[PDB]
Design a protein around this nucleic acid. Structure first.
Lengths: 154, 204
RNA sequence: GUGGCGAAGGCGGCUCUCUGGUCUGUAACUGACGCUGAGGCUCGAAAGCGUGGGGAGCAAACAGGAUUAGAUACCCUGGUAGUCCACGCCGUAAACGAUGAGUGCUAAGUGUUGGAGGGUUUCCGCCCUUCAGUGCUGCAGCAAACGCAUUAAGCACUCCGCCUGGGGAGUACGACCGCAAGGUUGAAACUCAAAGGAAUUGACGGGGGCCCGCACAAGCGGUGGAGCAUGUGGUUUAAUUCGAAGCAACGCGAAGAACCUUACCAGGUCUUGACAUCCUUUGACCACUCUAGAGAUAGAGCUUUCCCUUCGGGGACAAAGUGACAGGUGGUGCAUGGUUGUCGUCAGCUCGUGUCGUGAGAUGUUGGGUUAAGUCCCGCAACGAGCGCAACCCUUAUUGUUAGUUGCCAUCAUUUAGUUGGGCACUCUAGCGAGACUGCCGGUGACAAACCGGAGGAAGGUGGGGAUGACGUCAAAUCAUCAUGCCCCUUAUGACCUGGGCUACACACGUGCUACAAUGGGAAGUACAACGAGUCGCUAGACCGCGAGGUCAUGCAAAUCUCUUAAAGCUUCUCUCAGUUCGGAUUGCAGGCUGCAACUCGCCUGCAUGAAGCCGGAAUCGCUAGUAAUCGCGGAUCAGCACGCCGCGGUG
């Protein structure tokens, strides 16, 4: 705002796995406040992960998150009438925000016959350095570390 | 238009309804009968300076009480005018009526009385600047925490309208426990209509 | 370099030649030789003129490109005189410090340019004194204020130039000057009652700074594309009644157009009148039936029939007379009252006693910090006060006590069951009280206000939400809620009736609803609320109909009965990425309900048909938490008629 920084919106760790990350993942799949559907979807997807060439849904999910999250994002700014873009660092909460966002967005566009057949498949493809999510990360890193040219003294 | 009616903001908080009866399935008839009554008795009020009127009612009788400042000039010589009031009001209401006349003390500390009196000077070609000033002067001498007046319309019997009033002492309007009074009257000199408003603060 | 030099105009690379002035010390000399200066002469930025050279860059005039309503301008590409040298002419500038020259006298503080003395002495870098320039601050005094102030605009003497309300006008005439352009000198006739200087309070600026706010930024869902509902413009019409027009008009007045409403249009009708008072004859008026008529109305039938009586009156009322008169949603929101919108729930608007100012006026109310706050602290020629802010009012979050029916059922029997015996424990209902105050504990900070953290508690820093809208701004809106000054109509702009628009459709704009599917469509089963409404109203139950519904009947004027088993949700079985088992527009046929009557022009049911639409460019909107998104329920208005409006709760 204008007055100054604000709080961080504490979350309630889901009771099944006792992991706040699964809570945020449930919150991102959910649309229109229909939360039980989102919960059923995430649990069916994790069942599908473990049953087929899996070890545990938390482990492969964390690794997929690690492989997707970005570390260098740029910001397109305005100075006095000419606009450019400059890289900057990335604070931690924004990182997991972006990770979840990309994974869900690009699983929603897969093209199979169930959101589970999409989500489980996509985060498996992600934990093996594949999938449009990882390519989105690398597009970001390539835009950065190039557009540092008109950023070196910003 | 940016102020609420000061005795409608406070009704049901520190003041009461001027009509105290409870009825259901006979409510429209009662409300219009009260309206008829009150719109009639503005006949004597034209001379006798009545301020309020309180309508109560029982099984079939209607108990009325009026606040005036002229007790004798409203009851008659030995009781020959209240007789007429009752025998006339029976012709409307078709019931039994019983006027219980109150008398008002300190009449210069009443919104309708003051404003209606200082809206009768305007009709007799009097300048407004001293009517309001003498009104608040004779309202403070009775002892009052504050008073405020305001006249509006074509002033002096002249062209395009304007407005102006005068204040004396404090008149807090936002305080809910304030017991303020208010009234709005009319008059003409020869041009259109004028509006006179008056507020008096009498402690809480 | 607020450095240097020159009487001014002016003078900036370097070397030489010719030359003017200033400053300082000394004390050889002359002995008032001085100051000012009408007329006269000399010099005098830039532009311009003449003769002959020179000509890179820049650039009047001019050409071409743009922009605009136009652009003989500003902007871009070019481009001639001129800008440069020698010699002549011109003689003017805001040629300014808008401040003539000479001389003496009158507090202080501080920089810098060029010198001279004394001390300490590497003083050659430091201290002090003293001349002449050049700046800043400041006293007496001066000034109408601004200001000036040993570089006077102070106190005084000498000499010169010039002024006497604003226009006409630096014009005309004469005269001198100039190659010219022009320069110098310099009126009147007539016309106005002002024109000016400096400062004061407001309002404005295509002036600046600080801050705040779903104002941007970070996000989530939309609008703009498609079909339909609805309002507006436009066109059309016999009429498409009137009002609202950026934000702050456009699901607005209208919280209910088939007739009524209804002002508009076409036909059929009336004139003291549909509605009010008066005065007289007088006085009790009706309703009902039958023919004609679309009705309005007219013509006939039983008759509107004394309710006060002292014999002498008064209330209701039809007609008539009878004219005073009535009647107008006709005009003027720029003649008004009243009632609203918006800045904006932003934080402002004034007074008394003092002090300041020649005076209008100022101060307070400016400054730092903090705050949602002219809310608080500190400082300060101010010290206090009033309306605004906050508090007092409502609802929601926790509980004590009083009261247990129509509410409730924990310890008991009983049935279909809280039902019936029993009880008021629990929930609930509703009166009266408690509880939140930076109130304690730690740190920051001027120890201050305030901010950050903790304890306890249902709740913590205006706990959440509502009502509450200052002085003022927009000649904002409304004569159509109602009133009302002036104007207008009166056998019609008044009044009564039937039928028709207000719903017309080559189109354009706003606000919404339903979708484009698998986080979905269809079939069967199982659950969980709250606010409200009801007497000619809300309808239990049983039966008939595929359905919307219908019949017989039952309780309830209501914590008792009913509207009312909420929908998303959960569990099974299907369908398989397609213009489709998505979507539900449009059309055909058959019904139901209200109503005297659903063609124009109502809502609902069933069978048949099965359009556009596969997530929507420029641009643009809402929202900071039980909020956004999504799902149903109730009622005001109302025979009937809601995708609109006002509320309620569920998931979140």
């Amino acid at each position: 705002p204008r007055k100054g920084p604000v709080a961080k919106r504490d979350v309630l760790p889901d009771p099944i796995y006792n992991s706040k990350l699964v809570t945020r993942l449930i919150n991102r799949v959910m649309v229109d406040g229909k939360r039980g559907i989102a919960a059923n979807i995430i649990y069916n997807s994790f069942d599908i992960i473990k049953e087929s060439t899996g070890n545990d849904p938390l482990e492969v999910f964390e690794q997929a998150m690690k492989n997707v999250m970005p570390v260098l994002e740029v910001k397109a700014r305005r100075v006095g009438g000419s606009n450019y873009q400059v890289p900057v660092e990335v604070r931690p909460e924004r990182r997991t925000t972006l990770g979840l966002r990309w994974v869900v967005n690009y699983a929603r566009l897969r093209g199979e016959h169930t959101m589970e057949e999409r989500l489980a498949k996509e985060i498996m493809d992600a934990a093996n350095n594949t999938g449009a999510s990882v390519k989105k990360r690398e597009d970001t890193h390539k835009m950065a570390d190039a557009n540092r040219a008109f950023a070196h003294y910003r | 238009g940016q102020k609420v009616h000061p005795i409608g903001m406070r009704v049901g908080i520190i003041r009461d309804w001027d009509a105290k009866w409870y009825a259901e399935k006979e409510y429209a008839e009662f409300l219009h009968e009260d309206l008829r009554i009150r719109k009639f008795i503005a006949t004597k009020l034209a001379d006798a300076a009545v301020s309020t009127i309180e309508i109560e009612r029982a099984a079939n009788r209607v108990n009325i009480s009026i606040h005036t400042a002229k007790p004798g000039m409203v009851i008659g010589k030995g009781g020959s005018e209240v007789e007429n009031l009752r025998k006339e009001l029976n012709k409307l209401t078709g019931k039994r009526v019983h006027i219980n006349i109150v008398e008002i003390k300190k009449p210069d500390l009443d919104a309708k009385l003051v404003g209606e009196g200082i809206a009768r000077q305007l009709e007799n070609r009097v300048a407004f600047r001293r009517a309001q000033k003498q009104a608040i002067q004779r309202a403070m001498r009775a002892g009052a925490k504050g008073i405020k007046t305001q006249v509006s319309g074509r002033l002096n019997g002249a062209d395009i309208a304007r407005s102006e009033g005068y204040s004396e002492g404090t008149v807090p309007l936002h305080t809910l426990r304030a017991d303020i009074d208010y009234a709005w009257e009319e008059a003409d000199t020869t041009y259109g209509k004028l509006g006179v408003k008056v507020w008096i603060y009498r402690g809480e």
